[PDB]
Amino acid sequence: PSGEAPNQALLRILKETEFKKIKVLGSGAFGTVYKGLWIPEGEKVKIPVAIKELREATSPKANKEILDEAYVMASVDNPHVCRLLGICLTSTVQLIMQLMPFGCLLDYVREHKDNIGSQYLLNWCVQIAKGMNYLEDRRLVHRDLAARNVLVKTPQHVKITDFGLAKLLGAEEKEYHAEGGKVPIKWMALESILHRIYTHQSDVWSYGVTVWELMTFGSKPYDGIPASEISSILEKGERLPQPPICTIDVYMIMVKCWMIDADSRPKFRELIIEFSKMARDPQRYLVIQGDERMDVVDADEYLIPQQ
Numbered sequence: 569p570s571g572e573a574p575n576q577a578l579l580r581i582l583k584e585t586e587f588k589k590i591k592v593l594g595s596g597a598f599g600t601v602y603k604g605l606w607i608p609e610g611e612k613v614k615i616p617v618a619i620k621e622l623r624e625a626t627s628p629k630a631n632k633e634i635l636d637e638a639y640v641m642a643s644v645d646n647p648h649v650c651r652l653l654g655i656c657l658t659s660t661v662q663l664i665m666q667l668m669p670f671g672c673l674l675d676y677v678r679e680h681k682d683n684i685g686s687q688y689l690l691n692w693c694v695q696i697a698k699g700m701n702y703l704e705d706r707r708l709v710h711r712d713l714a715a716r717n718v719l720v721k722t723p724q725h726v727k728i729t730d731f732g733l734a735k736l737l738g739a740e741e742k743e744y745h746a747e748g749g750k751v752p753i754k755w756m757a758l759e760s761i762l763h764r765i766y767t768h769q770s771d772v773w774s775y776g777v778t779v780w781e782l783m784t785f786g787s788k789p790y791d792g793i794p795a796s797e798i799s800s801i802l803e804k805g806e807r808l809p810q811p812p813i814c815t816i817d818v819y820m821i822m823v824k825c826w827m828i829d830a831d832s833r834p835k836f837r838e839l840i841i842e843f844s845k846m847a848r849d850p851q852r853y854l855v856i857q858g859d860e861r862m863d864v865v866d867a868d869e870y871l872i873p874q875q
């Protein structure tokens with residue numbers, strides 16, 4: 569049948585003795601994530617990594633959901649999307665991921681805005697868009713996109729994460745239709761909210777929202793607003809306000825994402841190019857005051873195999 573190449577993504581399973589969890593960066597009701605060093609058996613190289621230990625799965629269906637989340641995470645191989653290093657099937661499943669010290673992107677902008685250069689913002693937007701498109705190329709829908717779900721290895725480099733929501737697409741199907749689950753409203757495209765329908769075009773809407781957050785240095789969208797309204801207002805046609813920084817050229821794009829009709833909103837591939845175009849000259853596009861002024865362990869990416 570289809571000529572598509574076999575996907576040889578390899579899922580490594582790890583003994584607990586293989587890694588240790590030094591401190592815990594974050595604790596989640598869904599899961600706990602630990603700062604940890606994973607040392608592969610054999611090679612005396614320590615890879616700093618982050619471990620997520622998820623809550624026990626009460627039901628098999630939950631069990632399946634993890635496997636898929638793992639399945640994709642292992643599968644993806646791009647710079648701006650973080651691959652899953654390995655899994656160990658302990659009673660409480662533990663997922664091993666590359667460790668990004670700076671942490672949540674949303675968190676970073678909030679704490680580094682003053683030092684937060686305009687040029688960086690254009691680049692991140694490029695980087696994020698670059699990642700999502702790859703996801704689009706894989707027929708993968710990232711159900712949840714937010715600043716929160718983007719992690720910074722460094723200010724220079726950022727990659728996507730937190731895919732549990734994300735679902736793969738049957739070739740026949742253009743769109744993926746959800747069943748009721750906890751969802752954060754502000755990011756979701758109306759089509760998703762009203763009809764529990766997701767498509768990459770759905771993702772873009774959220775992606776645009778992420779940019780808004782970047783532009784605003786983490787200001788929370790629809791701040792102080794109930795989830796329920798959100799369906800109503802957009803139907804209303806209200807949209808997130810322009811970033812003070814943004815040139816209409818930029819804020820304009822973000823608006824385009826929020827267009828009610830999915831097809832009308834820009835395809836991701838487009839976004840990378842356009843933003844990249846801005847990136848060559850951020851200064852014209854983004855107006856930031858004082859803009860001009862603005863040991864024994866090997867990292868995994870270095871770790872990754874070379875011909």
Ligand SMILES: *CCC(=O)Nc1cc(-n2c(=O)ccc3cnc4ccc(-c5cn[nH]c5)cc4c32)ccc1C
Binds near residue numbers: 729
């Ligand atoms: C915006 C909310 C957020 O970022 N939470 C969060 C941050 C985490 N975190 C951190 O707080 C400090 C350092 C740090 C370094 N590397 C990572 C790597 C991966 C994650 C992560 C979180 N969720 N999925 C992956 C976090 C990291 C760091 C850690 C967890 C959370 C939830």
